[PDB]
Design a binder for these strands. Sequence first.
RNA 1: AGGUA
Lengths: 50, 59, 1352, 76
Amino acid sequence: LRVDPTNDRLSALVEIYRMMRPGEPPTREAAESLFENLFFSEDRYDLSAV
Amino acid sequence: EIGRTTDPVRMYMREMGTVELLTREGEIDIAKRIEDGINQVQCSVAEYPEAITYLLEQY
Amino acid sequence: TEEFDAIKIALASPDMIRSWSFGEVKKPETINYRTFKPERDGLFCARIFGPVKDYECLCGKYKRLKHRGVICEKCGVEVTQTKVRRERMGHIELASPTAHIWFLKSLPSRIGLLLDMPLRDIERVLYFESYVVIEGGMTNLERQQILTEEQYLDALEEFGDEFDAKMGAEAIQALLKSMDLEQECEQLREELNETNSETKRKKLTKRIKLLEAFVQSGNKPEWMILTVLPVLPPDLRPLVPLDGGRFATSDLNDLYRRVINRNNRLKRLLDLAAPDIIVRNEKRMLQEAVDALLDNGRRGRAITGSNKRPLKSLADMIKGKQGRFRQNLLGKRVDYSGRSVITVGPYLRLHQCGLPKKMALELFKPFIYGKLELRGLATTIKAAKKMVEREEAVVWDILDEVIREHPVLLNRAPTLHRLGIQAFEPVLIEGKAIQLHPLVCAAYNADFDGDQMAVHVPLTLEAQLEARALMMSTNNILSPANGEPIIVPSQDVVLGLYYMTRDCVNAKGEGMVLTGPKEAERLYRSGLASLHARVKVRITEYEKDANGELVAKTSLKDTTVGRAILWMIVPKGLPYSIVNQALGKKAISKMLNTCYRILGLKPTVIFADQIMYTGFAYAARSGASVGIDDMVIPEKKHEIISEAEAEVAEIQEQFQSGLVTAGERYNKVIDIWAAANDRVSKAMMDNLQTETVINRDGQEEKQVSFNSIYMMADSGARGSAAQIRQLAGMRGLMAKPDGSIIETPITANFREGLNVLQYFISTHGARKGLADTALKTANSGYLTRRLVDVAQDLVVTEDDCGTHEGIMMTPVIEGGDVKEPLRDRVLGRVTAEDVLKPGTADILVPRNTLLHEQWCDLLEENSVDAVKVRSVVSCDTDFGVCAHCYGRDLARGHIINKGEAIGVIAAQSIGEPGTQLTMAAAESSIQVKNKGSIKLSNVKSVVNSSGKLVITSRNTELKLIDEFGRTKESYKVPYGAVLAKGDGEQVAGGETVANWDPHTMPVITEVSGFVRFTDMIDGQTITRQTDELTGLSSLVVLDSAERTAGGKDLRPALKIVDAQGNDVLIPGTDMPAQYFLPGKAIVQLEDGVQISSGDTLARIPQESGGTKDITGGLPRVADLFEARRPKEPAILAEISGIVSFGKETKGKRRLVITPVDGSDPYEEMIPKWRQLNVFEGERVERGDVISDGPEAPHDILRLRGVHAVTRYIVNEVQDVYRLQGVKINDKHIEVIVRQMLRKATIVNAGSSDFLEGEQVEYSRVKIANRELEANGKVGATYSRDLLGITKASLATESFISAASFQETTRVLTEAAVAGKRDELRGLKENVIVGRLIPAGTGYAYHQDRMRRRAAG
Amino acid sequence: ARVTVQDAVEKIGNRFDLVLVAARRARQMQVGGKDPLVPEENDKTTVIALREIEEGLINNQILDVRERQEQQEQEA
RNA sequence: AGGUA
């Protein structure tokens, strides 16, 4: 947490969006969509029964 | 942006992101100023006789 | 037909690029799809690159050979030969200048360093991330600085029509235009004479060297930015029709199509005055496309449609592995060659091999045609072709004729050493497999289990002769890595010989008296006697004596019938004692070696063939078979297994009691099982060895068993004692994953079938072995490639140079005993000094001369401890080595012939055994195993009141002088020890001559008085653990890895002063009286204690070893040849004189050596984690260690000298090799070393830059020139530098060799920017060029060319 | 058939220019113009050159002097 | 791709 430069969801989304795609000005909606589709999209992320 | 990038796609998106989208009447206003410019150049050609002589030759 | 002495590489100019081009490629069009005629003017174009089909315009206008000197002017297409399409280059006129990727993303960026501008800045400018000022004006803006969008806009608004700044490759090219080289060179030259600041002078020197090099290259920096892009001839990027919708197209074709598309789009956009964003985007397109074309892979890959794969680029086609593809590998395919499976050739003579009739016919078709037309059986080549395809009996006699004298080369699929290719006389055989001589398969490392060998036909008469003289098997009876023969009887023939010579205790026909071995053969073949039986036979042995004359001595020998039968085979001139013995592999190899040394070549070859035939015949007559009963289980196997189970059960029970620790319990169990395994193996070997108990005449006797498996074990045919141990005994301990030895071993063998679980256990060992073999094979291949690279250009160019330098040569003793004697290491070497006898001062070895067996025997008789030997490293020859300094070894006992390539043979010799490399009473008390004179070397010891010969420092050795001059046992005495023996006292064998605690090194005082604590704070340097019983303490001097905040400002020491307080110095020792305590020196004696000479002062704790710290095998050998650091370099005393400590702990503690005379100040760094063995105020000498641990080759060469580093490398590598039983003549490692140090660093120049890494040969010829001349400029002084084999091969004089087998792109870029001009005179350079190599047969040719060059 | 070239190496100690001189001799043997000096067993030029060098008839010096004398009768 | 040394 000390190392963390962010303190809110929006800046975390910005950092995630910039690390996943270099540059790429962090549009808030784009960052939210990227984060949701990375791990919470059934058509983009799945673990299956196993 | 300056993000140790080497992809022209990325900074092309950067370039296109600077300009904001237009509306329906915005296109009409820009085309209106275009029409004003082309009318100005048409008047400039109008004050020139020789181009008009050439046009009449083709007519 | 083409003559050229050298190849120049340089920067291509746009003008000369247009000069190469025959037309401008303006369209990305390729062909007309349905009509495959190339378009105009596309990537494929007859108007540009020439016509497609032979000598006809591609318009249907001219179709004849007449129209060839005139091109078709009735249309664009020209008419020439079609091969012209393979050579004509084109050019593309780029609308915007484009940067070259090679000059950009190489680790040294030539664009970056020429502009002295960091890489990120070039990347951002070129890729249009930021602007850069291409010269300013009267602004506050520098001549060169990057500006962002808003910064550039602000500068433009603030500064009007004075501001010249662009963006991208155009800006870079403008910058290169604005930069002038010669003027800056003049400015730097002026400034250097005026400037005195160190950093300023260094900057000026670096820049002036760079600019002067660029000017000497004759290149203009603007050429780094490509304005016109050359395009490769279409034939080298072929487009060939294929069936269906698929057609073979070059990735180069698609890349050039993309480049042309983007260039044309840029041209159109510029013509349309497109917005700045779009034109910048299209320039980005062009830059990316050009970068991918030149080298796709450093820009985030480029893929094409309908195919997901990185596109091939020009760099990717050049850069290859291993080495350049088309030139050497992969793979330089060859004609007139065949391939087939090999079988045994047990009837063949050594100089011949079986070649199947069909392969012989197909291989020699031109020869068959020639001879058929010669005798006139066919009137044309076509008729001869019909005759040979009909395979009539007529052509077969022609085939026999052409084969009779023609030799053919046989080649193994992997080639590890020069014996992998050998000539043989082909013998026609019906069948389909190549029959190979059984003796030769050992050299090929080929076992007949489906191995395939290739056959090559040396066509020209010179090549036929060359194969017969050099390639021939009979000419290569000796390994190039060692004088002992390589064609040695191996397994079946060895078994037959052993059975024929091994004697029984009772058999038919014992006690008979025979004359000649002929009666022995008659008795054996008639069944009137047995093959082996003690018999007196009268035999005439011939002895080479007097001057080389045979001495016939006829007398009676007590031998066996089989031995006499063998002696029949043995050629005249050998002693009978050689065969009157049981013959294993070693015995037969030694016998062949003696036969070759005594008789010569032809008797050796004939004798080898005859012994092969005899061994095979008598092995077949032996009927040696392995049954199920010939693995007799020892009777004590169950008893030993049950016992060991009992002790391990007891140990496990005691472990549960907590009496023994888990580690100690594990070690005890492992030791118990190891003892059980040894007992079982010994019982098995006792059972099998003397299994025969049959009576000689009625009295039973124990003698060597007739058991077959014991015959193959003892004769060394196949299977050692360890091998038979897994069969008849028990296979014992193995390891599990993580490489730990399993607690419970395998108690079963292969005669008592392993159960499921034990087999599953053994599977891990099997998998590990197989994976190890694969990885070690790959690593050995890479290693031998690097050795060939570094040793490529070395060749014997002079018969003699003249030099008394060399290496001090001694039998090597590591540990406590000698494992490699003087004779073997000196055999075949040349003397460098006329060494006297160990007694009288008599010269028994004349001036520098080759040492053959007779001289080695003379040296053994008068045992001299050391011999100076001319090594290749000390040879004064340049551009090669003199014949003497190398030696004799090849395939002959004579001196090396001038022109022989020793580098390649040495590289192969060191590389080939790489597949064979898969890798108390010590330090407590020295026990001399034999009785000899005791001698101390570099000893610092004085006898004290207790008679203790306490040795100080860890640089003292204890040798063992034998009866004449030879050391036979050597040991290392650590810092602090007790010795009851003197410097001349005789010591019995196995007697403890020295002793010290295995728990700690004791510091035994050699003086008396009170102990004074110098540089002490009780709590910073030492800690209080006072346990006073008689005045003692457990004060701990903190270890020399970390200390306290006040323990890092002082060096804790114990001064010895008398009652008066005056210093009492230790006599006869460099050590001062103030013991500088190193890390963990526990101060037992407190301040104010009278110390006696013979009392411990401070103990240094240890562990009596018990931990492995030695590695070997391929990684060790590679690290030795790469001159890698050992992760803890043992720093040496780098100058003689008195030593002293400096200021303590600025992070790293400083040590100042000031010589007693001369330049005093030699302060240096020492890291605080090291364990110092240096004591301030002692007289050290250059070479003495300063800290413990392993050494690195660099400082060894730098300080102790070239000879010392050569000795170190040779000894270390030979230690790895002798560990596996492989013997290599040290001259190979010597020449490899000589190639490693071919670069030196200039201190004082003659025409150099005082720091220039320069080839030593040029430095040596320059210093010779200045010394012979009256001009002693400057100068000039040099220091030899050591580089790893990869680095040495990488920094050669010829860029072709470096670019071939190493980083091709970077080497080519460096050569181009430097404008290098390699002048050949190197094996691989001439190989790439395609002319005779300057080695061996070709050396005569090149030497002729040398005479034709530089002179009429 | 010539099993060994050691005897030839004895006459010409370099063992490399031995190849050059015997190749020159064998090429003059195969290419028309020169006639043999040692009996053959239906053998090609190579073992002929080896035998000629082995008996000392041909080395570098003899080949060179012979090419002179032949040059002088052809120039006449 | 699999297999051979």
